C-alpha cells in the first residue's frame, strides 16, 4: 500500500520534473509552494508573463485527482496550487529539492470575539481536531525518506515568516486588520451550531475552517517552513438560541506578492 503510494509520488515527480525541463530554458527550481484558498485563485494573475509560466492540469499528473502553475512572482520561482491523497502533491513537489516554504491561504469563520468579517488572521498555531481522533495525514506507515515517525507541531508556524508578513503590510500601507491566532481544523460543516461555535471558542479557537492544517503538517514533515493566512469571511454566531420562554483578495494578493520576494 505504501509502496504504491511511493511510486505514485515518484511518478508524479518524474512527470513534473520532465515538463519543467522541456518548458523553461533555465533550470526552474521553485523556492515556494503557494496554496491559493477558496476564492483566492486570482493570485495566478500576479505571475510574470515572461518567462512563459507552465500550467499542468491535475488530470495529466499521475496520482493526482485544479492545476499546477510554475512561474515567477515578484522575481521568485514558485508553484501555485489553484487524506494522503490531498497531501500527495506536497510530497511530489518536495522531490524537486528546491521548495522550502509553504504559503497557504484560506477562508475561515471568526470565533474570537474581537474578529470581524474582512479581518485577516496570520495563523501561528492550530488545533487539528480530526488528527487527534484518527483522521491524520501521517496515519499509516511513515515515509521515512521524507520525515520522522513522530513529528512535533509546536514549531509549525515560522516566526520569521510572520514577521515578514507584518512588515509587508506596513510597507504596502494596507489598512485591513490582521490578527495573530490559532486556526482550528474541523472536518465539520461551516453549518456549525451556536453551541459548537461556543465550544470552539472555549477550546482555544480564533478562526475555524476545513482546510490548511493537513497541508501544514505534511509540509512540516517534509521540513518546509509554513506561513498561513486566513481571511475571516464571517463572524460565527455563539449566542444561545431564543428560549421558549471580494476586496480582501487584492490585499491578500499584494501581501503574498511582496512576501515571496524575500523568501
Amino acid at each position: 500500500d505504501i509502496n504504491e503510494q511511493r511510486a505514485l509520488i515518484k511518478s508524479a515527480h518524474r512527470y513534473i520534473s520532465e515538463k519543467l525541463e522541456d518548458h523553461f530554458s533555465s533550470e526552474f527550481l521553485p523556492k515556494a509552494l503557494v496554496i491559493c484558498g477558496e476564492g483566492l485563485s486570482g493570485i495566478s494573475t500576479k505571475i510574470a508573463d515572461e518567462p512563459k509560466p507552465l500550467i499542468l492540469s491535475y488530470s495529466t499528473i499521475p496520482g493526482f485527482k485544479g492545476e499546477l502553475i510554475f512561474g515567477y512572482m515578484n522575481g521568485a520561482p514558485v508553484v501555485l496550487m489553484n487524506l494522503a491523497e490531498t497531501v500527495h502533491p506536497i510530497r511530489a513537489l518536495h522531490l524537486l529539492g528546491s521548495i522550502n516554504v509553504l504559503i497557504v491561504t484560506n477562508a475561515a469563520g471568526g470565533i474570537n470575539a474581537s474578529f470581524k468579517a474582512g479581518d485577516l488572521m496570520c495563523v501561528y498555531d492550530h488545533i487539528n481536531f480530526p488528527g487527534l481522533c484518527g483522521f491524520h495525514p501521517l496515519r499509516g506507515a511513515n515515509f521515512d525518506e521524507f520525515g520522522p515517525r513522530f513529528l512535533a507541531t509546536s514549531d509549525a508556524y515560522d516566526l520569521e515568516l510572520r514577521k515578514l508578513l507584518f512588515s509587508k503590510k506596513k510597507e504596502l500601507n494596507i489598512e485591513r486588520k490582521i490578527h495573530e491566532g490559532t486556526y482550528s481544523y474541523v472536518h465539520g460543516p461551516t453549518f456549525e451550531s451556536r453551541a459548537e461555535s461556543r465550544f470552539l471558542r472555549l477550546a482555544g479557537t480564533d478562526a475555524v475552517g476545513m482546510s490548511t492544517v493537513p497541508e501544514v503538517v505534511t509540509a512540516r514533515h517534509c521540513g518546509w517552513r509554513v506561513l498561513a493566512l486566513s481571511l475571516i469571511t464571517n463572524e460565527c454566531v455563539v449566542d444561545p438560541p431564543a428560549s421558549a420562554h471580494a476586496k480582501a483578495s487584492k490585499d491578500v494578493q499584494e501581501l503574498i506578492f511582496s512576501v515571496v520576494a524575500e523568501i
Copy 2:
C-alpha cells in the same frame, strides 16, 4: 456510489408508498415522523384503532437494516419509527438516516419529533427530568436554528395545559458515539464545553431531517446524572467507592419507562397542532 444509494431510497419509497395505497381507503399522507427512543414504544398505543394502522417491518422494507407504524394520532396522520439504528452498532451514518430520506419522498412529512434518553451533565438536572433540545454539539461530526422555536413553545404550552408537573429543561444536547458511558473527566469536560445532556443518538437524524426541510422537535429523557467527581484517591482512607452512582443500561430502561407516560401525552397533544 451515491447513484446505487439513491436507488435504495427510491426503492424504499416505492415499497412504502405501495403498501399505504393498498391499506388505506383514503390517501395516507403523514405530516410528522415520530422516532421513539429508549422506552417510548408505548406511543404505539396512542395510535387510533380506526382507520386500522399499517405496520411494516424493517426486514421487509428495502434498505432498512424494528418497524414502521402508519396511522392516526390525535386526529393527525403520522409515522412511528419503532427502533432506531445507532452508529455505535457499526452502521454508517447513511444507513441510520436512510429511513428519513425514504419517508421524505412522500412529500407530506414536515416535522420530526424525536426522543431519546440522555445523561444529565447540567448539575441541576436530575433523573426524571426532560430536556427540550434547542441546540446541539455533534462531536463525531466535527472532530471526525435547528430546533424549531414554535414547536418548543408548543411543547411547553402542552405541558401547562396537561398539568404535567415533570420538569422540562431547555438546553444543549451533546451527541457522543458511545457505547461507553462517560468517565468522570469526560463528563466534566462535556460540562465545561456547554453540555446540558449527553446521549448516543438523535443528532444525525436531526441533521438529516433539517436537510429534508423538516421542522424538528427533540425531547431528551434525563435517565441519570453523569458522574463528575474525581475518583477515589489511593491516599484516601475513607474513599467513596468508584462504582458508586455508575451508569447502567438497566437504569436507562427503568427511568425511561417511568417518564414514558408523560412523554406520550406530550407528543399526543403536539401532533394535533403540528
Copy 3:
C-alpha cells in the same frame, strides 16, 4: 464483521491454548496481562528462567498483526506479557490493536490488566521522569467515533453499554503505592487523568492547551482502547504512565515580540521519549514485579 472477528478470536485462543499445554508440564493459567510500552521492554527480564517461559511471536498467532507474547512466571505468579503493542497511527483498526486482549480472555484466568506507556506532561506541576498512576481517562476520539467497542457487541464478553467511571480499580492503585513505599522508590508517582490521542504528531501548543482545560494530566497515544476492552471483559485495570516530556503550552512567540522565545525551544522528540523511558524503566519493572505477586 463480528463473526469473522469471533473466529479470529477463537482461532488465536486455540493456537495459544495448544502451545501452553505442549510447553508447560503444569496447567498455565495466567492471572495478569502486562502490556509493556516502548522503552519498558526490560520487564521481560523479570520473567523467571524456570519454569521455561514460552514466547509466541505475533507473526505466528492468527489475527495478531515484531512484537511477541511471553508466557511465564513473574515473582512466582503466572503472567502473560505483551512485549510491544499495536498503535492506530500505524494503520491498524482499534479492533486489531485490542484483539489480543479478547483472545487471551478466552483462557478464563486473567482478571487483571497492567498497562504501561509513555506520556507527555500536561499538568504543569509534572516533570520528566515522574510517574503518573492513572485513575481516570479522557477518550476524546471515542467521543468522536473512534472507539474500540464500535460495532456489534461481543455479548459473550460484556455488556452493550459499559460504564467507565469505575475503570481504574482503587485497591490496585493503593497496592502500587504500597509497593513504592516498600521498595524505597523515590520517584514521584502522581495520580491523574490520562488522555488518549491518535498521533503520530506531538501536540501543538493550542492542542495541549485544549487538553489541559479539558482535564488532562498526561497525554499519550495508547492505553485507553486496551483499558476499555479489558473493562468490557470484566478485568480490573492498573495503568501506569511514564512522564517523558513536559508538553509546550505557552502561546508561540508573537511577531510583535521584541525578545521572542524560539518556537522550536522545548520541542518534543522521539529520542527524548525513548531515553527518559529507559531511565525510569528499572523502577517500573520492580514496581510491577512486586505488584503481580499480590493480585
